[PDB]
Design a protein around this ligand. Structure first.
Ligand code: SF4
Length: 553
């Protein structure tokens, strides 16, 4: 196999026998073959748009297919075989439409050569062998490989955010058209300048898509507000919901009201505690446990059913006993785990089976007690603008440090905890995404009643951090966003974090520290281009980086 798309890839070069995440050869190769089929849909879809007869019938299929290949999302080979079969049939419908329109507009049959993605077919028995030959290493030139895979990695992150928006009813044609432009590009031989341009365009579309999801979440469920979240447990059986989808949360809360089963959040569902729409349910207890990678012991101790709405789902250990109470939904899948089917239009998912099961389970084991504060998204922070700005002016807040991003397993990540603890007492940490769990249960106190850690929400709520920085720039009358008293020390793990990075580069932020390693998917020449344009830096020692940031450097 070959896969290099997350931070934990083997030796920082590539997983080649079995993924460090657990992904086996056969599953890794089926994901490659699905991306191959998606490029084939994109070739005809782009050509039909060119001829003035665009077809939007595959928009959701393309989003879900890219999302299913994100790290820790879907582990069920049968699901990939089904999507590959469906994708071939969708591609062939587009092919037939294109051939007829081409002939009508040109007065002859189309006769130009097309990439294999556009033509190959087989039944399911052919998939495993074909899959070996269509993967990342088929691109021989290392710099073309880096730029193609960088684009597809960023695109997957954008597609995940766009899928959440689409679930809530919010779509922009430009985003779905871009998916096809980008995928089709990876079958063409383009200049370096053209490939870099498409990566920057993806950063631009990450801004558009994060804006759309911010609008969808806040219009539907309200603006986030300051909230104290309980981290201990109650005395009823519960259901634990993980992942990122807020519409699944809204339906779960409604269906559980009055049943004597409590609801708890986990991981990137923490921010659901912050939304006005959800705060009105008494049986919504609080947040259980820590970061995604600690899930095996914590899902075990939770005792009740667990529902994964998105990544990250980690494979069970041999000793784990919770398979019979693990449920997947959306693009998530796992062999042997029960799957909750998609809602009909205008209707809702059916969670009745989880509720029935939970009534049979013991209450959760308590793993800690106390509370966390959060809810500082853009509406809430702008409401406090006078106070924050005032505090900057007196020098009580000397610097903001953005420590948003995504967490992971490696021991080097203690760097982020130790930075948080050793920053000076007149600084404030801005965060979003599961990187927060490295420091959100420390007591770092406050400055004048502003908490020293301000949690804006899920990784997608990095958008709020940009909106805040743009406003401060206007208030202080600076010509360049980079001259604000803000430093960026961002941790990454999977492809949504890459989309957030591309958005920050599109907005012109330079001097970002990215860690705890730099991506394996940057070749030397491509890394140079990003360094010289954007001044991205690796992390150093805790002491050395703190001194540097406090200096604006
Ligand atoms: S998703 Fe990450 S750890 Fe898993 S196979 Fe790919 S690079 Fe390796």
């Amino acid at each position: 196999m070959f896969c290099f798309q997350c931070q934990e890839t083997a030796k920082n070069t590539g997983c080649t026998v079995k993924g460090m995440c657990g992904k086996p050869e056969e599953t890794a190769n089926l994901q490659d073959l699905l991306i191959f089929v998606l490029r084939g849909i994109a070739i005809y879809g782009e050509k039909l748009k060119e001829l003035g007869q665009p077809d939007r019938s595959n928009d959701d299929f393309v989003l879900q297919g890219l999302f299913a290949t994100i790290t820790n999302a879907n582990w069920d080979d049968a699901r990939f075989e089904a999507m590959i079969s469906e994708g071939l049939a969708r591609r062939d419908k587009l092919r037939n439409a294109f051939l007829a329109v081409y002939k009508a507009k040109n007065g002859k049959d189309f006769s130009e050569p097309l990439p294999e993605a556009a033509t190959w077919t087989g039944d399911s028995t052919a998939f495993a062998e074909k899959a070996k030959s269509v993967g990342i290493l088929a691109t021989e030139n290392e710099d073309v490989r880096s730029l193609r895979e960088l684009l597809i990695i960023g695109l997957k992150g954008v597609a995940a955010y766009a899928e959440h928006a689409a679930v809530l009813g919010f779509r922009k044609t430009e985003i779905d058209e871009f998916m096809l432009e980008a995928l089709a590009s990876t079958t063409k031989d383009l200049s370096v300048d053209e490939m870099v341009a498409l990566v920057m365009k993806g950063r631009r579309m990450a801004v558009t898509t994060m804006a759309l999801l911010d609008e969808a979440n806040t219009t539907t469920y309200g603006n986030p507000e300051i909230t104290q979240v309980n981290i201990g447990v109650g005395k009823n059986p519960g259901i634990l919901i993980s992942g990122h989808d807020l519409k699944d949360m809204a339906e779960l809360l409604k269906q559980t009201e009055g049943t004597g089963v409590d609801v708890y959040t986990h991981g990137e569902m923490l921010p659901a505690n912050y939304y006005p729409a959800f705060k009105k349910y008494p049986h919504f207890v609080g947040n259980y446990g820590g970061s995604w990678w600690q899930q095996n012991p914590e899902f075990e101790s939770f005792n009740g059913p667990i529902l994964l709405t998105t990544n990250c789902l980690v494979p069970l250990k041999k000793e784990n006993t919770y398979l019979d109470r693990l449920y997947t939904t959306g693009v998530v899948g796992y062999e042997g785990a029960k799957h909750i089917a998609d809602r009909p239009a205008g209707g809702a998912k059916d969670f009745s089976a989880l509720i029935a099961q939970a009534k049979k389970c013991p209450p959760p084991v308590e793993i800690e007690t106390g509370s966390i504060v959060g809810g500082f998204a853009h509406h809430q922070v702008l409401a406090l603008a006078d106070k924050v700005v005032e505090a900057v002016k007196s020098g009580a807040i000397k610097r903001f440090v953005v420590m948003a991003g995504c967490d992971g397993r490696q021991k080097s990540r203690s760097y982020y905890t130790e930075v948080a603890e050793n920053l000076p007492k007149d600084t404030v940490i801005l965060t979003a995404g599961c990187a927060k769990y490295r420091y959100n249960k420390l007591n770092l106190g406050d400055i004048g009643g502003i908490p020293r850690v301000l949690d804006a929400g899920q990784c997608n709520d990095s958008y709020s951090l940009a909106v805040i920085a743009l406003k401060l720039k206007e208030v202080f009358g600076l010509d360049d966003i980079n001259d604000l008293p803000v430093s960026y020390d961002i941790a990454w793990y999977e492809q949504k974090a890459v989309a957030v990075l591309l958005a920050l580069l599109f907005l012109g932020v330079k001097g970002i520290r990215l860690g705890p390693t730099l991506p394996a998917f940057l070749s030397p020449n491509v890394a140079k281009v990003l360094v010289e344009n954007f001044n991205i830096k690796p992390i150093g020692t805790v002491q050395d980086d703190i001194a540097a940031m406090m200096a604006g450097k």
